[PDB]
């Protein structure tokens, strides 16, 4: 979910890099806009090269925990439909 910031923070940071370039073209090597903006971009860009280190944990934990519950969850499904088969007798009517 947090990846929603990664996109926007990078979306704006890109517009600043350009809006910061439309001022240099003269004092380039000695300008803050063309220097800071770009520096900020590089640093915060390593977020998917540094942070993702934990992502592989979630992307894995989820599947692992699921297979550890799926067998149980599946049981409920079958247990349910068993009742849905009881509808055969007008009296035994069970809604999900």
């Amino acid at each position: 979910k947090i990846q929603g910031e990664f996109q926007v923070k990078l979306r704006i940071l890109e517009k600043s890099l350009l809006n910061a370039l439309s001022q240099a073209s003269g004092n380039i090597l000695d300008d803050d806009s063309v220097i800071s903006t770009l520096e900020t971009l590089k640093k915060e860009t390593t977020e998917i090269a540094l942070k993702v280190e934990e992502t592989e944990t979630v992307m894995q934990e989820i599947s692992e925990v699921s297979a550890l519950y799926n067998p149980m969850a599946l049981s409920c499904s079958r247990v349910y439909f068993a009742m849905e088969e009881l509808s055969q007798f007008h009296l035994y009517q069970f809604s999900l």
């Binding site: 890099l17 350009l18 370039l21 380039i28 090597l29 063309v34």
Partner: protein
């Protein structure tokens, strides 16, 4: 709606279809539009399979084809636009990088020209410091 593609080729199967309406060599538009017909028909098939395999019944009249076609155009207008705007920013911006690098890449070389000169204006000048010692010191005799 531009459904024409220049790099298209129209595979053999599609060609054998276009004939046995679609300009000699099947065009991209034909590829898409022709498929729309295929897709629509598969449903009739699927609806018969249902009634058979399962116990339900469904129908697929032209009303759907229109809902389908109308849906097909609406999305290609929504997705294409968002994609273009996203390419507009990428293109415009990328022009600055390729260009700004040219201004800097070359500037560094010009700056290297100044240092390439200093090596002569400083080393050869510093050589005057050698003749100053070799002469003054030897003159101290």
């Amino acid at each position: 709606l531009d459904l024409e593609n220049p790099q298209y080729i129209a595979p053999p199967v599609f060609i054998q279809e276009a004939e046995i309406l679609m300009a000699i060599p099947p065009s991209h538009r034909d590829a898409v539009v022709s498929s729309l017909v295929y897709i629509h028909q598969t449903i009739g098939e699927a609806n018969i399979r249902l009634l058979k395999r399962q116990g339900r019944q469904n129908y697929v009249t032209p009303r759907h084809y229109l809902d389908f076609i109308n849906q097909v155009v609406l999305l290609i207008n929504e997705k294409r636009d968002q994609l273009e705007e996203e390419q507009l920013h990428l293109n415009i911006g990328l022009k600055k990088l390729r260009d700004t690098e040219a201004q800097v890449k070359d500037l560094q070389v010009s700056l290297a020209q100044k240092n390439r000169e200093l090596d002569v204006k400083n080393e050869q000048a510093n050589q005057k410091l050698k003749q100053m010692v070799q002469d003054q010191q030897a003159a101290e005799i």
